[PDB]
Design a protein around this ligand. Structure first.
Ligand SMILES: FC(F)(F)c1ccc(-c2nnn[nH]2)cc1
Length: 305
């Protein structure tokens, strides 16, 4: 496939303010979304059908993430806390307290006994899921932390910040193992490891995505054409069909690139405001996208390749 052919299948309405993130459950059955309206919503991944609302945060939510067994969620909120949720019961199992300002990003490790978080307070924290206690506080950055992610075996954490740095941390010790710098350091608005753990994908507010070989500290690929000068927009590796990079954009489109050739292969039209978040289904050729306040909807897209 020189190109995918994603086409719109469902539009999901219900959030009453900007959506902030969307994530597919690892078992592929569900989509979770978080919003400035202080709510988490659960939707069917294949039919787009609204399932349930999960409530409890006192202010808007910036991010949500799934545990590996698809049974728990963690959410990051402007109320300076994270909450761990039992999805089936809707119960808040733990409230993770410690950050001194807005919490912007969160993720489980693969084993899902740990949670990592990043905050406006410029720190990265590592939490024990079962006790809800903070294990480590990392003096990670000198500006707000925009993303945090574990690698494939959980031994590394990558963090990014508006200070222009991506850093790699040892989970066990909390030591800073690496700082990634290019020829220039625009604010970094998103970062994550590749599925095989060998690479890092970073978004910067100069309208650019970069693929880094972090063990060698070198920038390999570069993806442009989209618009990103303001917001924390998620980006993804799509690997179920052809190998693509997928991202939202401030011109209201979903951008899809050939991972290898860096060429734009598709631009998905339909949203009426900034596409702040995209997610890729774990086993099927399905993308979810979500948009900001003037739109408020989530869209599900499907390709034959
Ligand atoms: F060589 C490329 F193009 F840089 C590259 C980058 C990432 C991956 C990959 N596979 N799985 N996860 N990441 C494969 C190839």
């Amino acid at each position: 496939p020189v190109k995918p052919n994603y086409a719109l299948k469902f539009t999901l309405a219900g959030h009453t303010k900007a959506v902030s993130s969307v994530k597919f459950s690892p078992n592929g059955e569900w989509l979770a979304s978080s919003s400035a309206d202080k709510l988490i919503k659960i939707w069917g991944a294949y039919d787009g059908k609204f399932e349930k609302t999960i409530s409890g945060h006192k202010l808007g939510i910036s991010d949500v993430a799934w545990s590996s067994d698809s049974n728990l969620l963690v959410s990051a909120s402007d109320d300076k806390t994270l909450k761990i949720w039992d999805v089936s019961s809707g119960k808040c199992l733990k409230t993770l307290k410690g950050h001194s300002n807005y919490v912007f990003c969160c993720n489980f490790n693969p084993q899902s006994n740990l949670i990592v978080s990043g905050s406006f307070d410029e720190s990265v924290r590592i939490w024990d899921v079962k006790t809800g206690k903070c294990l480590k506080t990392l003096p990670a950055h000198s500006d707000p932390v925009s993303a945090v992610h574990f690698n494939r075996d959980g031994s590394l954490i990558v963090s990014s910040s508006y200070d222009g740095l991506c850093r790699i941390w040892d989970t066990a010790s909390g030591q800073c193992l690496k700082t990634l710098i290019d020829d220039d350091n625009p604010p970094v608005s998103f970062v994550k490891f590749s599925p095989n753990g060998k690479y890092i994908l970073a978004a910067t507010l100069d309208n650019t995505l970069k693929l880094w070989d972090y063990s060698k500290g070198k920038c390999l690929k570069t993806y442009t054409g989209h618009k990103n000068e303001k917001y924390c927009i998620f980006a993804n590796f799509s690997v179920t069909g052809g190998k693509w990079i997928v991202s939202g954009s401030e011109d209201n489109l979903v951008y899809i690139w050939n991972l290898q050739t860096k060429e734009i292969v598709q631009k998905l039209q339909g949203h009426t405001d900034v596409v702040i978040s995209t997610a890729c289904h774990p086993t099927e050729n399905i993308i979810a996208s979500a948009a900001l306040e003037n739109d408020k909807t989530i869209k599900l897209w499907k390709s034959d390749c």
